[PDB]
Curated annotation (Swiss-Prot), chain C:
The keyword Cytoplasm does not apply. It comes from the Eukaryota. Core subunit of respiratory chain NADH dehydrogenase (Complex I) which is composed of 45 different subunits. It holds the Pfam family Oxidored_q3. InterPro entries: ComplexI_Subunit6 (IPR050269), NADH_UbQ/plastoQ_OxRdtase_su6 (IPR001457), Nuo/plastoQ_OxRdtase_6_NuoJ (IPR042106). The chain crosses the membrane at residues 1-21, 25-45, 47-67, 88-108, 149-169. GO terms for biological process: mitochondrial electron transport, NADH to ubiquinone; mitochondrial respiratory chain complex I assembly. The gene is MT-ND6. It is found in: Mitochondrion inner membrane. This is NADH-ubiquinone oxidoreductase chain 6. It catalyses: a ubiquinone + NADH + 5 H(+)(in) = a ubiquinol + NAD(+) + 4 H(+)(out). Keywords: Electron transport, Membrane, Mitochondrion, Mitochondrion inner membrane, NAD, Respiratory chain, Translocase, Transmembrane, Transmembrane helix, Transport, Ubiquinone. It is an enzyme of class 7 (translocase). It comes from Bos taurus (Bovine).
Curated annotation (Swiss-Prot), chain D:
PANTHER family: NADH DEHYDROGENASE [UBIQUINONE] 1 SUBUNIT C2-RELATED (PTHR13099:SF0), NADH-UBIQUINONE OXIDOREDUCTASE SUBUNIT B14.5B (PTHR13099). It is found in: Mitochondrion inner membrane. Its main location: mitochondrion. Belongs to the complex I NDUFC2 subunit family. It comes from the Eukaryota. It comes from Bos taurus (Bovine). It is a single-pass membrane protein. There is a minor unacetylated form of subunit B14.5b. One of its GO terms (cellular component) is respiratory chain complex I. This is NADH dehydrogenase [ubiquinone] 1 subunit C2.
Curated annotation (Swiss-Prot), chain F:
The lineage of its organism: Eukaryota, Metazoa, Chordata, Craniata, Vertebrata. This is NADH dehydrogenase [ubiquinone] iron-sulfur protein 5. A motif (Cx9C motif 1) lies at residues 32-42. It comes from Bos taurus. A motif (Cx9C motif 2) lies at residues 55-65. Keywords: Disulfide bond, Electron transport, Membrane, Mitochondrion, Mitochondrion inner membrane, Respiratory chain, Transport. PANTHER family: NADH DEHYDROGENASE [UBIQUINONE] IRON-SULFUR PROTEIN 5. Belongs to the complex I NDUFS5 subunit family. GO terms for cellular component: mitochondrial inner membrane; mitochondrial intermembrane space; mitochondrion; respiratory chain complex I. Contains two C-X9-C motifs that are predicted to form a helix-coil-helix structure, permitting the formation of intramolecular disulfide bonds.
UniProtKB/Swiss-Prot annotation, chain H:
The lineage of its organism: Eukaryota, Metazoa, Chordata, Craniata, Vertebrata. GO terms for biological process: mitochondrial electron transport, NADH to ubiquinone. Accessory subunit of the mitochondrial membrane respiratory chain NADH dehydrogenase (Complex I), that is believed not to be involved in catalysis. Complex I functions in the transfer of electrons from NADH to the respiratory chain. The immediate electron acceptor for the enzyme is believed to be ubiquinone. GO terms for cellular component: mitochondrial inner membrane; mitochondrion; respiratory chain complex I. Keywords: Acetylation, Electron transport, Membrane, Mitochondrion, Mitochondrion inner membrane, Respiratory chain, Transmembrane, Transmembrane helix, Transport. The modification N-acetylalanine is found at residue 1. The chain crosses the membrane at residues 21-42, 57-79. This is NADH dehydrogenase [ubiquinone] 1 alpha subcomplex subunit 11. Its main location: mitochondrion. It is a multi-pass membrane protein. InterPro entries: NDUFA11. The keyword Transmembrane applies. The keyword Cytoplasm does not apply.
Amino acid sequence: MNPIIFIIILLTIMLGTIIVMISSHWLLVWIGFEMNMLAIIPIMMKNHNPRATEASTKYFLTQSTASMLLMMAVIINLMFSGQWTVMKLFNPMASMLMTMALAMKLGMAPFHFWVPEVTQGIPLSSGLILLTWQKLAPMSVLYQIFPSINLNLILTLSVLSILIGGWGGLNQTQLRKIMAYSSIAHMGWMTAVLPYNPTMTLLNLIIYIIMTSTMFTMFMANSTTTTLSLSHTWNKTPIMTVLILATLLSMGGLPPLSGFMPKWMIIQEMTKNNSIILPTFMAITALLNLYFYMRLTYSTTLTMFPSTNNMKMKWQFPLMKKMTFLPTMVVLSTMMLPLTPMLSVLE
Amino acid sequence: MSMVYMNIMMAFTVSLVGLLMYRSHLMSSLLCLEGMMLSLFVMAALTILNSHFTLASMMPIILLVFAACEAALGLSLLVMVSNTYGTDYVQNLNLLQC
Amino acid sequence: MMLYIVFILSVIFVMGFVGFSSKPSPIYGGLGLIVSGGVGCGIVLNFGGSFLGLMVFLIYLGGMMVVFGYTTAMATEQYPEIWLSNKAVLGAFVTGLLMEFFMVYYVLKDKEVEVVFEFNGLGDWVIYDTGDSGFFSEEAMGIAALYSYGTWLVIVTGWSLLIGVVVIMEITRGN
Amino acid sequence: MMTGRQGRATFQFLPDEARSLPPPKLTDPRLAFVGFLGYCSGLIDNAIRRRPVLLAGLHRQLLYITSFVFVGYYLLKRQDYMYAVRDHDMFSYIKSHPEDFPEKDKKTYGEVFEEFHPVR
Amino acid sequence: MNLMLALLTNFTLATLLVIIAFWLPQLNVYSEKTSPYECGFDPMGSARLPFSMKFFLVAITFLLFDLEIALLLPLPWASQTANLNTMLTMALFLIILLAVSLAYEWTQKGLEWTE
Amino acid sequence: PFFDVQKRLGVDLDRWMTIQSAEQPHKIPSRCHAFEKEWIECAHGIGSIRAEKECKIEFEDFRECLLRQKTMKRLHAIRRQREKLIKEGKYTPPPHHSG
Amino acid sequence: PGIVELPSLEDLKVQEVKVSSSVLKAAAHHYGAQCDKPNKEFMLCRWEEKDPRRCLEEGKLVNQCALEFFRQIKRHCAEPFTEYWTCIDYSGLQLFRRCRKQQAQFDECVLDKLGWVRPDLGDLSKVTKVKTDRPLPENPYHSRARPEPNPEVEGDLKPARHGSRLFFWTM
Amino acid sequence: AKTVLRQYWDIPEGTECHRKTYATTSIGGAAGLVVSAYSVALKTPTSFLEGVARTGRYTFTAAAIGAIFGLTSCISAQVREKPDDPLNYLIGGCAGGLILGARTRSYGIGAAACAYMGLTAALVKMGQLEGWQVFAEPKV
Ligand SMILES: CCCCCCCCCCCCCCCCCC(=O)OC[C@H](COP(=O)([O-])OCC[N+](C)(C)C)OC(=O)CCCCCCCCCCCCCCCCC
Ligand SMILES: CCCCCCCCCCCC(=O)OC[C@H](COP(=O)(O)OCC[N+](C)(C)C)OC(=O)CCCCCCCCCCC
């Protein structure tokens, strides 16, 4: 692909998302998603192989269906309020369709089947956009319509996401499928605290993006896409295995690492609202996530898997990958708990 | 909510149920997406024309503009699916496992 | 009665949808969407929008003409399926019409029906406005404001159509 | 919960009313920790690219420390402003609704009866 | 009423002519008479087989440009506004971007039919 | 909006089409202009929590104008009663209601 | 809630102006020059009162003045006017362009026998001012009392008491 | 589901066991139909009757579990004259677990189901008495 065309298509993806965040009119919000899907698909088809074609097609079919439901919600909201403002919806049926449309876009359970497959079928760089940047626009809308969202619907999707994400990640050896099911589980935490304190939804999203972007950057550095491919990293870049250990432990929510902050703050807000059974269930179910992160540390950093002879040839060359912001991201993804009160800037 | 809104909203539901129940052809499902856009256009045009919401009269046109982009985008993917398997069957799109 | 022309057109509008929603050969599905587009133009045209009705019909006539060419190239088989050749297609076709019949039967008998929303069967004419406009078409004045009021809409749609051409070439390049 | 606060300063990093609050001291412990995180980023940058960790590129290490401290200073000003605003609203609301926050009648433990539970 | 009666008359006349065509003449139908025409020899395959479209890319582009006529046709009414400076700017901007799309596809060999 | 770039920059990107009582071409009014204006002015600056209960009268009239649910029910009863009387020969329609 | 108040059929009784649309369009320019004050009075009432029930009396003076306008044409300009509006009535669009010769004959009769000067181009579209003793409506929308605003929060902005007070944090 | 639950909780404990058994059997049966739908949708049956057979297998397992819970938890609260006692639900929950074992033809699943379904039923009853909220309305 022409480098200029890649840059233009990349900026169109951002423009679609930015239109959704600055739009106060529902029509412009819908235009943002349509522009975002129009530009994302060519980046999925970049390598032009059958798996990338299937991933793009499954992604297009799911996103297109969600945008239809979102437009139905907008029009129904128009019939019952006579205005297009991006605020609380004025009809229960409009809220359900918009909530479900935003759930399909996010890949929440039970609308999750595409996330594991689309991520596997596209390169690591495209997958990073799929699991970090594509979550900003739908989360922007949920942040503004949460007063009208049915509590049972949103909490049901959150609980199913935490369960399916944890279970699905146990039976996986592909890193892109592991990161895909991890993403679904984390969506549950963002939307579970949404009815109670939307600020903590932003905190978990920001921390999830930083940690997720760190993992893909380190997988991109070594061109590793499988557990066993990542198991050779200790024999090429020993430092990279320590950074993967610290980040994976952070993603598992273990203190004193950064990734414990979003769980800690989400439990606080839910317990203030006398929600005790759900935070306890969510925290315990999250141990499923920590298990298949621990399984990656074992085969990556804490043990030394068998190597191959040709690995000795890789010792004579440096890492030429850009690895942009990796030294900064890995630090922010591991040592930020002492700065937790800085979550107030998000308010 | 006149009796016309019933049929228009039923048309959307029929096209939605049609899109969620694939038979074999990817092209058959693409028609259901274009059918759903038609229902939304008609439903939006009716509400706007009936309430004399003058400035909203351009919204249905802007709704067709982005329906064509999606329709063209869906056709472009259908070309590449056909070039890889010789048909537009959706059962061939199963190399990626959940 | 001609007082129910809008309702009668909306019944055909649904029947056309059941035509392509049952998913026969896309050749016949394309025909169904043309019928719905034609009657959909009629329905919109009877609420005071002639440009909108004629425009959507115009856009979907060209839309299904490209789909027709793509059906003979990539969505064709030896025995294209009709609404009678397949039990799955026939089953979904008969089901759609039966639900349309029951909804039409109940609304015209009870003058009401409650499915998610509450619908009224008095006739679509009871909600029309009793005042006349001036020397212009309100729908035409609203659509013409896209260039004086909709500066932001023109830019995003204009950019979207531009990128749309760039994207389809990228997707179909194959190398 | 403070998204729609009456303060008509929308999409501003630091509203002008935030200039009434003391700035963070340059020796603030929170600002020192942020600066330390910059130093760790400098060392990790050297290690992933296989350079002498402590010595290589002192020019680049200083820019890591400065960049972190610079951004950290403004995030601390906004952090302290948001907490100052939180207390301002809380005290104003309590003043505007005295009936909801009455002064409880004071009692002494010589007057209040507390059940005694033997440990035997 | 007039338009509907005009349409009914045109398609009623068309239908009655077809009906006369099939019921007036003397018919002698047999298998060879109704076989498909392929210049005298039996067709080698089914006419329902795939037929490659070499102008598929131009056909997709027609969908995008056919939507510019919807955006451009309101121009005669748009010229009646009091905001002529804004209207003329966005009219030319919209047409120019339509032209840049044509230029991009033309230069990138997008309008050339596949071999 | 999540980020309010419009309000700070002073640029009106999409606010001009959000409500039907805003400025329209040639000052063409919407059918429910008065009802929308009243509901918007009643519920200005008081938040949706309060407006949901303190401006309930204006919002119910606004919804009545938009969808005409109560008017159509009232017309249905009158029309249904008239047929019952006529079906049992108990009411003669006047001339101006027939021709 | 409440009973819609309507005028009686006797309050709506008035002598109608039974002349076709071609008659009105032929005399429109002179009609708008002579009957301006009762016309503009009634048209101010509708836009201020926003209720047709509050402007019935003004609406009758529009009819009364229009009749007197045509009676004066019927006394002096009966024949030229008939030819003028017959020629406007012939066209499907009731165009003025096709009846200039007949318009001139109608314009000169009124000018001599009545002193009526045709308004120039743009005159009848002017926004004019009208003097009226009818009081300005105070609550034309019948609005209720607007809810009291939330108690505004104002004062000096002091530092957060003991910092963030987030669990164990001292700052 | 809100309708059935309100019907179940309106009947006082240990009374009208015929009605409470109807309520619980409805809840279990509905759960077995929701499982059958996804199973049929995601694991396509080889034939129509093979899929109707699967639907009847899951729907009967869930209906039997629901029926035995309400019956066993209602007579227990009737014999003991102790309505507001989680022990009644513990007995009912374990009985439902045993029925799951019989349908699965596994002693191990019978023991595990009895232990965890027994605890869950007891916890459900405690939450009804104390006022525990699973989906709590936002308050602060
Ligand atoms: C809000 C908090 C949320 C908490 C969430 C908690 C999630 C955990 C729930 C997991 C339940 C999974 C149950 C699986 C059952 C599988 C059974 C099976 O397949 O057969 C296995 C086996 C039969 O398999 P087998 O016949 O093939 O042989 C097994 C041996 N090997 C492996 C060699 C083949 O049967 C069992 O052993 C099951 C034991 C039944 C007894 C269970 C009692 C548990 C009671 C709780 C623990 C007691 C301590 C706590 C006391 C509390 C006092 C108040
Ligand atoms: C009409 C009103 C009826 C009222 C009935 C009252 C309730 C009684 C229900 C009985 C159901 C039944 O029959 O249980 C029977 C089943 C038996 O196992 P199975 O799978 O059938 O073995 C079939 C094996 N084959 C396939 C080879 C034939 O139990 C069980 O699995 C329990 C066995 C393990 C003991 C668990 C107790 C210890 C763990 C608990 C710790 C707290």
